[PDB]
Design a protein around this ligand. Structure first.
Ligand code: HEM
Ligand code: HEM
Lengths: 145, 144
């Protein structure tokens, strides 16, 4: 249940999400492409889903990948801004869930983003504590897939 | 090209876009207002949004609300990329594709200018501001 998952976002979890987002969300282009390139490097089997972006190995040089990455960061911004209201958080999460369901992305494969997030966070000196906080937010989307 | 349309956004236009967007402060409210106004003045567009269900339900419609909030973040995206044409262009093309796939022409996309003008007016931002936003919408139209 996406609603029970949303209930898992307690005061402490929300604070950690906001605190870490202040840092990694300051450079959407840089960290966005970082997340994607890490995903493709650690989970090569997912590259096939991104046909439209072309040669993703080009990283920042790929205009389509850069546009995709920046936009992805605004989806996370959206989630963070909706933390105060689970009813709004849920309806935006379901909007993005549909975007992935049509792409044939399961909850299991969507969860493959946890590795990249943990690595990107770790590079900014944010440990497991924060990685786990983000895993709970990702869990809300997974509940809708 | 899209780059030409983006590169021709002047300092004064960007200033008006940012100042008016500052007042982007209520994405849920203004996002839904934008959509409901589009449906009220251009009833012929309702058919394109069948995935959202009964859009006459307004704020109560969770799908419409989710769509509206997300639409405002697309605009947030554009506004944040104003000073770097290369980045603005790649995000604009990303969203252009989303509309090209739905068969939305450049002319049809321009129908949003009416609703934007009205929403701006509700906050007392006049024609100068509506004109500035029409120029930003024109950047997207250059990709359609
Ligand atoms: C933090 C988690 C993630 C977020 C917030 C997210 C967000 C997004 C957004 C905003 C889009 C664009 C929606 C559209 O325009 O249709 C997108 C597209 C996509 N996402 Fe994700 N995503 C995430 C993780 C993943 C993962 C892990 C996979 C795959 C294993 C995945 C696969 C896709 C695919 C295939 C597309 C389509 C790209 C294209 O063809 O343009 N996403 N995602
Ligand atoms: C300021 C102008 C506009 C912006 C920024 C905008 C933004 C968006 C965004 C972010 C989406 C979701 C993309 C996706 O996830 O695939 C969307 C969907 C859509 N847009 Fe727009 N749009 C604008 C104007 C229009 C206009 C004027 C029309 C039609 C006359 C239109 C028709 C559509 C349709 C049919 C969808 C698909 C809705 C669905 O089935 O979920 N858009 N738009």
């Amino acid at each position: 249940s996406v609603y029970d998952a949303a209930a898992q976002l307690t005061a402490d979890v929300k604070k950690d999400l906001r605190d870490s987002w202040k840092v990694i969300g300051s450079d959407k282009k840089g960290n966005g492409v970082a997340l994607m390139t890490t995903l493709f490097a650690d989970n090569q089997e997912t590259i096939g889903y991104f046909k439209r972006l072309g040669d993703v190995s080009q990283g920042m040089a790929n205009d389509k990948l850069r546009g995709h990455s920046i936009t992805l960061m605004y989806a996370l911004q959206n989630f963070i801004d909706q933390l105060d209201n689970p009813d709004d958080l849920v309806c935006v999460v379901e909007k993005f869930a549909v975007a992935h369901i049509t792409r044939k992305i399961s909850a299991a494969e969507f969860g493959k983003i946890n590795g990249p997030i943990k690595k990107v966070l770790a590079s900014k000196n944010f440990g497991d504590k924060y990685a786990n906080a983000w895993a709970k937010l990702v869990a809300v989307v997974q509940a809708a897939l």
